[PDB]
């Protein structure tokens, strides 16, 4: 099956900028998951064919929520992970299918100078522990923007960065404590060691020509899925975002 993840920076604003209807007719994708819609209601036309979709908004206007559009209907969609703390802004949702969940994540930045570093350690760790709890029961598929570049490799300039939100010690032990739990990141798998491999740029004049950027989107499966993966891939050249899509092609 293939999958797509992709932080839209706003479904208006990509929509505005691309067009959305006919990329999603292009790839033709079994699965596509967004991250910060920025909507509620109500506020946008997003009826595809082709496509059973699903919707996480935030409570406050303007700001997070996430979609997941499939082809095929699932057995059930959960939203959020049951804790009001985790459940206001519209981050998570849950696909489950026969044989395997789906599930993508947007996750809280830790802003400006780590100030908000203690929620988002509480955050890892309450997800974690679902995503835990959903791995007991059938393999996980969880793809998103995850606010982290993992390594030095998943980021231009990591020198710059350790004292910044992505990049902090804190962020980058709470992504492996993830993987260390028993899960994959879909890309490493593949290519291990590819530098330069980024889903994230600054809007900033020559920043994204320059490929000065961050890998902070991905596909994360249950290791026993591992040999499932196909191929993982960053689809640098799609524009409309700050961020690119990420895509996996799994069997199951
Ligand atoms: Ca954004
Ligand atoms: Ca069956
Ligand atoms: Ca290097």
């Given at each position: 099956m293939k999958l797509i993840s992709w932080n839209v920076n706003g479904l208006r604003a990509v929509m505005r900028k691309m067009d959305f209807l006919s990329y999603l007719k292009e790839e033709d994708a079994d699965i596509i998951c967004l991250q910060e819609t920025k909507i509620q209601d109500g506020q946008v036309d997003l009826q595809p064919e082709d496509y059973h979709v699903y919707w996480n908004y935030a409570v406050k206007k303007g700001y997070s929520g996430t979609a997941v559009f499939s082809k095929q209907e699932p057995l059930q969609v959960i939203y959020g992970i049951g804790v009001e703390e985790h459940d206001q802004e519209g981050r998570v949702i849950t696909l489950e299918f026969e044989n395997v969940f789906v599930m993508t994540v947007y996750t809280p930045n830790s802003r400006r100078g780590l100030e908000r570093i203690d929620y988002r350690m509480q955050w890892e760790e309450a997800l974690l522990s679902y995503i835990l709890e959903l791995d007991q029961k059938?393999?996980?598929?969880?793809?998103?923007?995850?606010?982290?570049?993992?390594?030095?490799?998943?980021?231009?300039?990591?020198?710059?960065?350790?004292?910044?939100?992505?990049?902090?010690?804190?962020?980058?032990?709470?992504?492996?404590?993830?993987?260390?739990?028993?899960?994959?990141d879909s890309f490493r798998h593949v290519?291990?060691?590819?530098?330069?491999?980024?889903?994230?740029?600054?809007?900033?004049?020559?920043?994204?020509d320059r490929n000065i950027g961050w890998r902070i989107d991905y596909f994360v499966v249950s290791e026993s899925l591992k040999e499932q993966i196909e191929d993982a891939s960053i689809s640098a050249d799609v524009m409309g975002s700050d961020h690119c899509p990420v895509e996996l092609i799994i069997n199951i």
């Open positions: 059938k393999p996980v598929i969880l793809c998103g923007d995850l606010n982290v570049a993992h390594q030095e490799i998943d980021l231009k300039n990591p020198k710059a960065n350790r004292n910044n939100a992505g990049f902090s010690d804190q962020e980058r032990e709470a992504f492996t404590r993830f993987l260390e739990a028993g899960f994959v290519y291990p060691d590819l530098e330069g491999a980024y889903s994230w740029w600054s809007y900033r004049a020559g920043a994204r």
